[PDB]
Structures are given as C-alpha cells and as structure tokens.
C-alpha cells in the first residue's frame, strides 16, 4: 500500500512537496514514479527514481521539480517549485517491485491514491 500526503491550492510561482509513504519492502523496489492526471486529459510521466539513485523526469518538469527518496523512511518526495496553473492536476505515485531482490517481493505494480494540487495565476 502507497500512501500520500502534501497537496494544496498554492499561487503560481508557488512551490509545494508531495510525498510518497510505502507500507514496502524498500529491497524489493526497483524505481518509484510521478503521474498526473487532469480532467479531460489523459494520465502524464512526471518523474521516476532508480533504486541507485538514478532520476528522470518529463520535459514539463525538467529542471524544475526535483524527486527524491529517503528509503529508511520508506519515503519518495516530489519536490515541486516553480509552480504554474499547467500543473493543476491529481499527482499518483507508483511503486515497482521486482521478485529478484527478495522472497517477499512481487513483479507488481502499486499506487497510491491521489493527491490534488491545484495552482492559479
């Protein structure tokens, strides 16, 4: 289970930190990612981080939000700055997991529920 926290309605230019908390075996994940959704459009790529560290993020965000992860607290953070109106959407968190790291682990996909931000002019 992915849990998040973190939304807000901020003003553009504003920034905001989004969280990502998975009831996970750390070991068992192989990269975590950002999505939004807005209404009307289909889902986006936001952000993605390797388990060593590696990012990757859409060219919406490139240079200007930052992904990061704190694996003993189970946490991923999307670190939003520079915010404008076009980032207005529900912000869902994925977990990847692959068997070979561990017994435990699952080829499986999880997610969390959705977090709004909302950000006007």
């Known amino acids: 289970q992915l849990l998040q926290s973190g939304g807000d309605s901020v003003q553009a230019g504003g920034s905001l930190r989004l969280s990502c908390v998975g009831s996970?075996?750390?070991?068992?994940?192989?990269?975590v990612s950002w999505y939004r959704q807005a209404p009307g459009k289909e889902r986006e790529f936001v952000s993605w981080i390797h388990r060593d560290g590696t990012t990757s993020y859409a060219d919406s965000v490139k240079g200007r939000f930052t992904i990061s992860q704190d694996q003993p607290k189970n946490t991923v953070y999307l670190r939003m700055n520079s915010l404008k109106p076009e980032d207005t959407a529900m912000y869902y968190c994925k977990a990847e997991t692959l068997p070979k790291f561990g017994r435990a682990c699952r080829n499986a996909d999880y997610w969390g529920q959705g977090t709004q931000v909302t950000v006007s002019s």
């Open positions: 996970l075996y750390s070991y068992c994940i192989s990269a």
